[PDB]
Motif scaffolding. Structure first.
Motif, mmCIF file in Angstrom:
data_model
loop_
_atom_site.group_PDB
_atom_site.id
_atom_site.type_symbol
_atom_site.label_atom_id
_atom_site.label_comp_id
_atom_site.label_asym_id
_atom_site.label_seq_id
_atom_site.Cartn_x
_atom_site.Cartn_y
_atom_site.Cartn_z
ATOM 1 N N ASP A 172 38.664 56.435 35.569
ATOM 2 C CA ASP A 172 39.506 56.156 36.749
ATOM 3 C C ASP A 172 41.009 56.200 36.440
ATOM 4 O O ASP A 172 41.830 56.017 37.326
ATOM 5 C CB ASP A 172 39.137 54.831 37.432
ATOM 6 N N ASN A 174 42.658 54.148 34.430
ATOM 7 C CA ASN A 174 43.171 52.890 33.881
ATOM 8 C C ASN A 174 43.047 52.860 32.360
ATOM 9 O O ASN A 174 42.102 53.413 31.802
ATOM 10 C CB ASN A 174 42.417 51.691 34.452
ATOM 11 N N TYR A 178 38.971 45.488 26.628
ATOM 12 C CA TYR A 178 37.934 44.557 27.031
ATOM 13 C C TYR A 178 37.699 43.597 25.876
ATOM 14 O O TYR A 178 37.616 44.029 24.734
ATOM 15 C CB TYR A 178 36.631 45.307 27.360
ATOM 16 N N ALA A 184 37.839 42.187 30.945
ATOM 17 C CA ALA A 184 39.089 42.849 30.592
ATOM 18 C C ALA A 184 40.099 41.802 30.149
ATOM 19 O O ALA A 184 40.276 40.796 30.826
ATOM 20 C CB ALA A 184 39.625 43.605 31.782
ATOM 21 N N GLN A 191 44.936 52.830 37.303
ATOM 22 C CA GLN A 191 43.796 53.451 37.987
ATOM 23 C C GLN A 191 44.233 54.052 39.307
ATOM 24 O O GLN A 191 45.041 53.462 40.020
ATOM 25 C CB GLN A 191 42.640 52.466 38.229
HETATM 26 O O1 LIG Z 1 41.508 44.789 35.373
HETATM 27 C C1 LIG Z 1 40.670 45.666 34.652
HETATM 28 C C2 LIG Z 1 39.914 46.534 35.652
HETATM 29 O O2 LIG Z 1 40.862 47.233 36.463
HETATM 30 C C3 LIG Z 1 40.294 48.043 37.487
HETATM 31 O O3 LIG Z 1 39.539 47.267 38.432
HETATM 32 C C4 LIG Z 1 40.335 46.557 39.362
HETATM 33 C C5 LIG Z 1 39.712 46.857 40.717
HETATM 34 O O4 LIG Z 1 39.896 48.222 41.040
HETATM 35 C C6 LIG Z 1 38.241 46.452 40.574
HETATM 36 O O5 LIG Z 1 37.474 46.925 41.654
HETATM 37 C C7 LIG Z 1 38.194 44.920 40.397
HETATM 38 C C8 LIG Z 1 36.794 44.288 40.362
HETATM 39 O O6 LIG Z 1 35.769 45.227 40.119
HETATM 40 O O7 LIG Z 1 38.907 44.537 39.216
HETATM 41 C C9 LIG Z 1 40.236 45.048 39.068
HETATM 42 O O8 LIG Z 1 41.136 44.326 39.885
HETATM 43 C C10 LIG Z 1 39.338 49.096 36.916
HETATM 44 O O9 LIG Z 1 40.078 50.102 36.262
HETATM 45 C C11 LIG Z 1 38.291 48.442 35.989
HETATM 46 O O10 LIG Z 1 37.508 49.421 35.352
HETATM 47 C C12 LIG Z 1 38.941 47.503 34.960
HETATM 48 O O11 LIG Z 1 37.959 46.780 34.247
#
Ligand SMILES: OC[C@H]1O[C@H](O[C@H]2[C@@H](O)[C@H](O)[C@@H](CO)O[C@@H]2O)[C@@H](O)[C@@H](O)[C@@H]1O
Length: 275
Positions: A172, A174, A178, A184, A191
């Motif tokens: 994505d 980002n 982790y 994370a 992202q």
């Molecule tokens: O913060 C790490 C997390 O960032 C991104 O996800 C964000 C959001 O888009 C997600 O939907 C929610 C919960 O699922 O969390 C974050 O706010 C992603 O890049 C994800 O893979 C990453 O772990």
């Protein structure tokens, strides 16, 4: 006038910060828990290897000096103030390290003692240029830390591990670290912004680029070509400019310092020396 010392309160960690007084009964442990650096009640400063004493601080240690301690009121103490010092009135002595030549007074604030996973104790002039996870302790000297040298591209999708923790430039876009529980600990928040490339550059800057070399995020650590990027097993991610100034073995004041390497040429967070 100057810095004064506070009591050490990090028993069982691998690092003794500058200007902290380690007292009798207190100890460091290497990150792998194999080695312990212990100040005993009898005034001996000792390293134990799986519980067996394999080193004692005395006049026989290369690049150390022992001088008279005249002060009867000076408690048994071990501390770092650029050099390391053991105040042992029971033997009328101060045992101290002969560090390599100092380069600035700022080193007095930055230099701490590390008990490494190879059993060496090392004084390291250490500066955290960027710390992505300030709540997670920095843990130097661990064989399981992942280190990235400058000029390292983070290939999209590749999972770079340090124990159970990982750093990933994701599908994505980002860039995420982790921690050991799968959550994370840090992310660039890039992202869905069109990220094409993530790189720890030769200038020591960690940068996520979008289309057209557009900058989406960076660590603001440019201009430090000797920095490394470290992911720890505990989920910590940081960029550090570090050099050792003393060690109980390997070190010679005129030798070049370098990090040990894995059989695949990757650096690990253990200092060594050669010509
Ligand atoms: O913060 C790490 C997390 O960032 C991104 O996800 C964000 C959001 O888009 C997600 O939907 C929610 C919960 O699922 O969390 C974050 O706010 C992603 O890049 C994800 O893979 C990453 O772990």
């Amino acid at each position: 006038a100057g810095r004064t010392r506070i009591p050490f309160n990090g028993v069982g960690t691998s690092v003794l910060p500058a200007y902290q007084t380690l007292s009798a009964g207190q100890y460091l442990l290497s990150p792998n828990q194999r080695f312990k650096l212990l100040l005993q009640g009898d005034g001996n400063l000792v390293i134990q290897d799986n519980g067996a004493t394999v080193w004692v601080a005395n006049e026989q240690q290369p690049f150390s000096s022992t001088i008279p301690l005249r002060n009867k009121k000076a408690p048994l103490a071990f501390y770092v103030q650029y050099g390391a010092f053991l105040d042992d009135y029971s033997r009328r002595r101060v045992w101290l390290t002969d560090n390599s030549t100092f380069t600035s007074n700022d080193q007095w604030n930055r230099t701490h003692l590390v008990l490494q996973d190879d059993g060496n104790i090392v004084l390291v002039d250490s500066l955290a240029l960027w710390n992505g996870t300030p709540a997670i302790p920095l843990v130097p000297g661990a064989i399981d830390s992942l280190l990235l040298a400058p000029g390292s591209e983070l290939v999209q999708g590749v999972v770079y591990g340090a124990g159970a923790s990982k750093l990933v430039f994701q599908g994505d876009g980002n860039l995420v670290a982790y921690g050991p529980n799968g959550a994370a600990t840090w992310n660039a928040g890039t992202q869905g912004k069109g990220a094409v490339r993530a790189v720890f550059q030769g200038d020591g800057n960690l940068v996520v680029y979008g289309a057209g070399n557009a900058v989406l995020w960076h660590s603001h650590t440019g201009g430090h070509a000797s920095a490394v990027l470290r992911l720890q097993a505990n989920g910590s991610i940081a960029i550090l400019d570090e050099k050792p100034v003393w060690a109980r073995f390997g070190f010679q004041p005129t030798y070049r310092h370098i990090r040990k390497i894995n059989p695949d040429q990757k650096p690990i967070d253990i200092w060594t020396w050669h010509f």
